[PDB]
Amino acid sequence: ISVRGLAGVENVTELKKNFNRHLHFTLVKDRNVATPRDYYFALAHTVRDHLVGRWIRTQQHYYEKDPKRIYYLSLEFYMGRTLQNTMVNLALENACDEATYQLGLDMEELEEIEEDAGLGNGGLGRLAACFLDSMATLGLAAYGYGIRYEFGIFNQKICGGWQMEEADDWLRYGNPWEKARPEFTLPVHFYGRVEHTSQGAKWVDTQVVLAMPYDTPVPGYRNNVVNTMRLWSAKAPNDFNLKDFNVGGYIQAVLDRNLAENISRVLYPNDNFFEGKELRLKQEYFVVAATLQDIIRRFKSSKFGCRDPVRTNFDAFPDKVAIQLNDTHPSLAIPELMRVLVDLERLDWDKAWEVTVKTCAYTNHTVIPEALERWPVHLLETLLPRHLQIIYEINQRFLNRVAAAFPGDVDRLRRMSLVEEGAVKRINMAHLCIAGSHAVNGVARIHSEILKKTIFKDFYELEPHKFQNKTNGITPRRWLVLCNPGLAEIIAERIGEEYISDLDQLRKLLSYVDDEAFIRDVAKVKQENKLKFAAYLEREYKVHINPNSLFDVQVKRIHEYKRQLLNCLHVITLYNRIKKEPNKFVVPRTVMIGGKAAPGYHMAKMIIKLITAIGDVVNHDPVVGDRLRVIFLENYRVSLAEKVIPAADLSEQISTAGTEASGTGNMKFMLNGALTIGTMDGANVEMAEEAGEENFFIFGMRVEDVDRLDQRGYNAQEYYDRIPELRQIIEQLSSGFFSPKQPDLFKDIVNMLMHHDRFKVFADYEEYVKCQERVSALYKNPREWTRMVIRNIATSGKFSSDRTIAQYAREIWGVEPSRQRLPAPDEKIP
Amino acid sequence: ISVRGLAGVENVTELKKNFNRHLHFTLVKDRNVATPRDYYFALAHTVRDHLVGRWIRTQQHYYEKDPKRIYYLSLEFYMGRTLQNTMVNLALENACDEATYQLGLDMEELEEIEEDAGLGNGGLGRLAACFLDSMATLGLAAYGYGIRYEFGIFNQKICGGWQMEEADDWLRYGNPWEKARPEFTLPVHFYGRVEHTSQGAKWVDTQVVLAMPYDTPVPGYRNNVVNTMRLWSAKAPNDFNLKDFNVGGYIQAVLDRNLAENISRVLYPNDNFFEGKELRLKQEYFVVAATLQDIIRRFKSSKFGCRDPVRTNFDAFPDKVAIQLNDTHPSLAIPELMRVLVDLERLDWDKAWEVTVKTCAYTNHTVIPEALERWPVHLLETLLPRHLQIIYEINQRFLNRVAAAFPGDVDRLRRMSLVEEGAVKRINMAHLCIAGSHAVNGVARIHSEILKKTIFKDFYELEPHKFQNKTNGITPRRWLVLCNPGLAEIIAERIGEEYISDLDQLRKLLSYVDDEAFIRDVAKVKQENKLKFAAYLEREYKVHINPNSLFDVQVKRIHEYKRQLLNCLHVITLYNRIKKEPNKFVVPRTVMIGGKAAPGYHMAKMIIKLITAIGDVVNHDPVVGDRLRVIFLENYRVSLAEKVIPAADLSEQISTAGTEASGTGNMKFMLNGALTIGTMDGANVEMAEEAGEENFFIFGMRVEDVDRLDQRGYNAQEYYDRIPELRQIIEQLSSGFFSPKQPDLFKDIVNMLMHHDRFKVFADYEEYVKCQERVSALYKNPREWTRMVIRNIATSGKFSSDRTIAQYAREIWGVEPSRQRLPAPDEKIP
Numbered sequence A, B: 001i002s003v004r005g006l007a008g009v010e011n012v013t014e015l016k017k018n019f020n021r022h023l024h025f026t027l028v029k030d031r032n033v034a035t036p037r038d039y040y041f042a043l044a045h046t047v048r049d050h051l052v053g054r055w056i057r058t059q060q061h062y063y064e065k066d067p068k069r070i071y072y073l074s075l076e077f078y079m080g081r082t083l084q085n086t087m088v089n090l091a092l093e094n095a096c097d098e099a100t101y102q103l104g105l106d107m108e109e110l111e112e113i114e115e116d117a118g119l120g121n122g123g124l125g126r127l128a129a130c131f132l133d134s135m136a137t138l139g140l141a142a143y144g145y146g147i148r149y150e151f152g153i154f155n156q157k158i159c160g161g162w163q164m165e166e167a168d169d170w171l172r173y174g175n176p177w178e179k180a181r182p183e184f185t186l187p188v189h190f191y192g193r194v195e196h197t198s199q200g201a202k203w204v205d206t207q208v209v210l211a212m213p214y215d216t217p218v219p220g221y222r223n224n225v226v227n228t229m230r231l232w233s234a235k236a237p238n239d240f241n242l243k244d245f246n247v248g249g250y251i252q253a254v255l256d257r258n259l260a261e262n263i264s265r266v267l268y269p270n271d272n273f274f275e276g277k278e279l280r281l282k283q284e285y286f287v288v289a290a291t292l293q294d295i296i297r298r299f300k301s302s303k304f305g306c307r308d309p310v311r312t313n314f315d316a317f318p319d320k321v322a323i324q325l326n327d328t329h330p331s332l333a334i335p336e337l338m339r340v341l342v343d344l345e346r347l348d349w350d351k352a353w354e355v356t357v358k359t360c361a362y363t364n365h366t367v368i369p370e371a372l373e374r375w376p377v378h379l380l381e382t383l384l385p386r387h388l389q390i391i392y393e394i395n396q397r398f399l400n401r402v403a404a405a406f407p408g409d410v411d412r413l414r415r416m417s418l419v420e421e422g423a424v425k426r427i428n429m430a431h432l433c434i435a436g437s438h439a440v441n442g443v444a445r446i447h448s449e450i451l452k453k454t455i456f457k458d459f460y461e462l463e464p465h466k467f468q469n470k471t472n473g474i475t476p477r478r479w480l481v482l483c484n485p486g487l488a489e490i491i492a493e494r495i496g497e498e499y500i501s502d503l504d505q506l507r508k509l510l511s512y513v514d515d516e517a518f519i520r521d522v523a524k525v526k527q528e529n530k531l532k533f534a535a536y537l538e539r540e541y542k543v544h545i546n547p548n549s550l551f552d553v554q555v556k557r558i559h560e561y562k563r564q565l566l567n568c569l570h571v572i573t574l575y576n577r578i579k580k581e582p583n584k585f586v587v588p589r590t591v592m593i594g595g596k597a598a599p600g601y602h603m604a605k606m607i608i609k610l611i612t613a614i615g616d617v618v619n620h621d622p623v624v625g626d627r628l629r630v631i632f633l634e635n636y637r638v639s640l641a642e643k644v645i646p647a648a649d650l651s652e653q654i655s656t657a658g659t660e661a662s663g664t665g666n667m668k669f670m671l672n673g674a675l676t677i678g679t680m681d682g683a684n685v686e687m688a689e690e691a692g693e694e695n696f697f698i699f700g701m702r703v704e705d706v707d708r709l710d711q712r713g714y715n716a717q718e719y720y721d722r723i724p725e726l727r728q729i730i731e732q733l734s735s736g737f738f739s740p741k742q743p744d745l746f747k748d749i750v751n752m753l754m755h756h757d758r759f760k761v762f763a764d765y766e767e768y769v770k771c772q773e774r775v776s777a778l779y780k781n782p783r784e785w786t787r788m789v790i791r792n793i794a795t796s797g798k799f800s801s802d803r804t805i806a807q808y809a810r811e812i813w814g815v816e817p818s819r820q821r822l823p824a825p826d827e828k829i830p
């Protein structure tokens, strides 16, 4: 059937009776009233049964051996569905496929019923999810820590071509994967004041919110390792949230509990954009506060909570603990670690600081100013009074370090300050993370260089040893084996299965680049993938596409820096050229653009409306026929990505050079048989460097050209004046050609493009359409297109998150990865 | 061990491995980190496994046979713990006791870990729970319908002698008994307006709240019948509760969902008191609206949703459906049934009314005015516009019926109106229930007569056939076998086990009233029970009591009509007599008073403080010694009742004659070996009539004497003037003898007792202490006390809820009870 494992006789029979056990005892249903949703749950429960045994021994193991623990703090974990991924990592897919088949059910139909765990916005949240899988696969004693939002990223609905947002009630039917652990509930404090008495400061008169943990298993790939992702939920204490007496109402007091519990109610839907709301800050401290108590409790036991030097010596803390900060969101971990060590454990400042800097490491994901977290001091002052005091003290001592290093450099002093003066005083969270971490890394080579040359230049000059790079990567399990079994199978037919956990082996496919059968096969799976997607399209969304055309797809969050608009300009250009010479042959294209816009991002929502507006015109022009279709992919999310990426021919990574930190979707397309048209931005540089620039479609300005233009001054009018095709498009938008009933509908876009384009869309236009002509030329030659595809796939090995994690482990965490199978799952009951 | 069933070889082994399966696969724990709470859950899950098989066939059976369905609507269901009760009804107790023992655990210790399902206030909510058990035991196709509150009756804490209320988060750790059924979610409407168009009225522009059901199994006693209790939970739709666009905030929209969901957040803690708040009314319509759709859906299928006359003829509706109204709380079921039939199904008014009156029946539980539900018309007008219209129309036609029956009786017309004029117009819910129900019943003989003679006299004259009586009862399973196995065992030793489901057989115990061994045994179990309680007291609450003293206990909700105050006066009298003649012998007594006061009931909370105040003085007077102790039983609830009742010697049922509708605690004490001191009120009359007045301690005014006094005019001063002992007590309270630091602390109580005593406490004082002297005299003669106890127990058979339910079934629902064992639980999978 494929290498989805063995469909053993004993195990298919075992699976079947357990499926029935759950359908009866767990779901309390009988075959006669069971719906596909019930069947999905019986299977999910049956599959989950297979990893609890491994989950329990993995955790018991770490307790016995007591290795260095890796804690990955993130406010986002973009998990997606977890049924197939668990089957794949446990080598259960074929057995389950067989068993359900015998039960008379279609496993694929049941898989579609599982709701996505959308606890993420985009790139940052998915990275965390890929990292978790790789850390388990590499046998690291790692823990994912975050917030269990009851409402994840909103479900996007397109009404009249406009995005409509609606609550993502992913828990509505229950989550069979998580395990509530109410017995490990921890208290978290807010507000209060600081009392300075005799021997130390005291955080007093605080409001208490409880953090209840929920553990979700994270299985490694076929190694019997099941790590844990612990997600905190907010709960109100039953005392003060009722007991603070003297009138108000008993009923109202109980109803008011949903004020402390709102902390974990919903994920902020912002991608690369900072919103300084109090609710956000509370979520940030809530995950940090609860997680640290857990980390310290685990350490206090270790082998110190037995003997060792005997005396809670936190000197070995950094040798047993490593906490990685996914962006500055969990940055309060630094002053919170200090608060506990100093105020509670009573260590001296310097010893505590040494310990803190040694266990914390920070990861930066963007260079755009509006994405940077700068919290107003009055907020920190009211909500976390002691943390502000600790931050001021950290700043004081850090700046003294700078003064001592750069005598007389008074401007450098204000530039590096953690405290920003001006309208309102703010705390620069990124400066905080650099100061309190022993390592700071970028997510791609050029982004990491940019950090040292620009944004964090002063900090780099102060401590050059802190700055590193760790190029992002994706997990080949979910992003290849799971979503593209057809391609995984033909690769395995030639080079084996060891590449799934050693992606570098794909290089061996280079010797099949002239193999006639392979070329035919690589081409065949892509055709099969396109056919399946084209079908899904009509199934769930309804209104035909042509599977013989070039599948041009750009899927990511809607942003001005990602330039979906530049893509739009090209689409309109194609349309106008066809209308000029209708009877001329052009390569057919289905351009698919999908992604979510943050609810308050006006420009982004206007761009979604433009895309659907273009589709309304292009898709109903009889002269165009089936040569050009414009489709907007609704509700782009992880599970939808698993469907489009394998069916894509062209991947669009066209951000303005210097703006996309790394990107990971680009990697997803490369490993799945799509050719890439993009700018020398983020990881695109390392990808083209790996496949060879000849097998990549690079165009536009490089970082240097962008800066040259900025020195000069960017004037869009110049481009409008010298390019008639561009002029024609802008006047079409301006006159209502794409919006008849509302002719001035797109004035904001035109106005922006002409007067305030921060990402110079027009400057790359000419080279972009020129370059697009070149991919069309190559698509006309199926054999050469596929051969170039093979060159990309065979050379994508470097972009596996296993490589990324191995580097973090060695160069930052100080732990060694291991592909050693844990001692089976085998029963056991001590 | 006892007749807690057989501890079979095959089943104890089967239980044990399943206990381990759950501890591993369900709880995801290993013996080395498992706590008693984990052990309780493994057992609970193991026990629950035994009734799902029976649950599924019982429901499938009712679908095949299609009998008349009984729907018990109540806003309260006081369930308590459900682990032991399930073991008892499934004959699993000994096997589970053995198995856990072999596993090295104490089953009794694990049972104490289960949280009570306190979805009730007192008498009314517990009746519903006893009814459910009896309906299952008598094989009726009955369904319990209500609201799944996430916070039940508050946990009572005594601080400085004052009650403190704190949220009852009973779901904190999960509920292993319920089964969420999100697939049967139903919409409920609120607000909107009424459009009158061409062919009918339309309820439009409403706000939608979703009702998600949760089913809990209700097993009959050893007959393999497992009925269902469906509890609704409020959920917000993900559309409009987000989709009603045009600014406000995406985040705020999501946080605002907890506004529609507040509907099922908390139970109103009022006992026999009406609070006209909007939240209450919304809960009342919410349970009614969701339940009726479910009832009609089930009917539409039946055998009509196959063939029959073919044409949705609702003429057979009353032949297939019976809905019982537990008080006026679910009274909107009447106008809601009309709304659906008329507005949606399009039946003519008269046919719909006929159907409605024929399927609905109402139960009245109290005669005090402040307990009566009178909803302001402006509230109904805004929240349920169409229902108000239907109510006005019902009133119109009903009053025409009256005018026609009593020509010219203009006052009778205003008296009977469903609409009350005055300050604000109100709708009298009770009048609504009488008009739209084919039966109206009281809960005890005297209460039912009072309804006909007083409160509902006019309605009785109009339709005498509607009014009935159904004396309350309690379930002998939870209230005997479960809480007092020792007494159940010795009864079974002489007359067998058939009495558990045929309590009348206890009469056979009358022939052992002179049996020396039985008397010794009856006396022994009571002594063992007292010893166990006296121990629990020191275990969980701490500060000694004497098990040789007479256990004088009054446990019920704190009310002015229950007269805990009259009990207080007696306690103080005993104390004063001892202090007058210290070296005189008096029968030792431990008087225990327990119960909760509604949060806003000032007088009730003042009474709790008086009780603890008396204890502070009495319990620390060296001259009193161990002859008199005053203890306040904290957090009185179902599980605590199972502990005190079996250990009680004297039961206090001293409400003012004519105020306690029936009472059920009185019955609980009678079946468990306690003698009763009380007034000729409620069921006390039927109990004394059953045991013989010679075996009952009756005192005070009868209903007639109370009325005579009211004609005359009640003057408390007269009693104060002629009784020196009474005078001495009031001056003690007035001068601060019981409150030194705050001498005027009890001025409200004294003031009330002297000038506004609605329940004439002083009028019964003399006869009450005189009567108390008589029980002390009899306690001094152990043999005669026990013989009288045997006369009570042997004669309590009439007070089983099986008898009550059999009467409802025959005289109201039109169904026949059946003690037929359903065809085993046996596997099966169609």
Ligand SMILES: O=c1[nH]cnc2c1ncn2[C@@H]1O[C@H](COP(=O)(O)O)[C@@H](O)[C@H]1O
Pocket: A056, A059, A060, A063, A298, A301, B030, B032, B033
């Ligand atoms: O005190 C202990 N004794 C025995 N095993 C323990 C103890 N603490 C943790 N463990 C084991 O380690 C796993 C890790 O628990 P953690 O504290 O949540 O990391 C547990 O589920 C147990 O198997």
Ligand SMILES: O=c1[nH]cnc2c1ncn2[C@@H]1O[C@H](COP(=O)(O)O)[C@@H](O)[C@H]1O
Pocket: A030, A032, A033, B056, B059, B060, B063, B298, B301
């Ligand atoms: O349409 C039907 N076909 C077969 N069995 C049904 C059907 N509707 C109800 N049942 C059975 O009746 C039980 C009662 O379901 P209810 O509608 O919730 O009362 C179900 O769990 C099924 O066993």
Ligand SMILES: OC[C@H]1O[C@H](O)[C@H](O)[C@@H](O)[C@@H]1O
Pocket: A122, A123, A124, A127, A272, A365, A366, A443, A472, A660, A661, A662, A663, A664, A682
């Ligand atoms: O590092 C993970 C991702 O984080 C953010 O989404 C960045 O915009 C993206 O370039 C990066 O790939």
Ligand SMILES: OC[C@H]1O[C@H](O)[C@H](O)[C@@H](O)[C@@H]1O
Pocket: B122, B123, B124, B127, B272, B365, B366, B443, B472, B660, B661, B662, B663, B664, B682
């Ligand atoms: O009918 C059930 C119970 O309802 C109420 O609590 C009444 O006050 C009580 O007398 C009655 O026994």
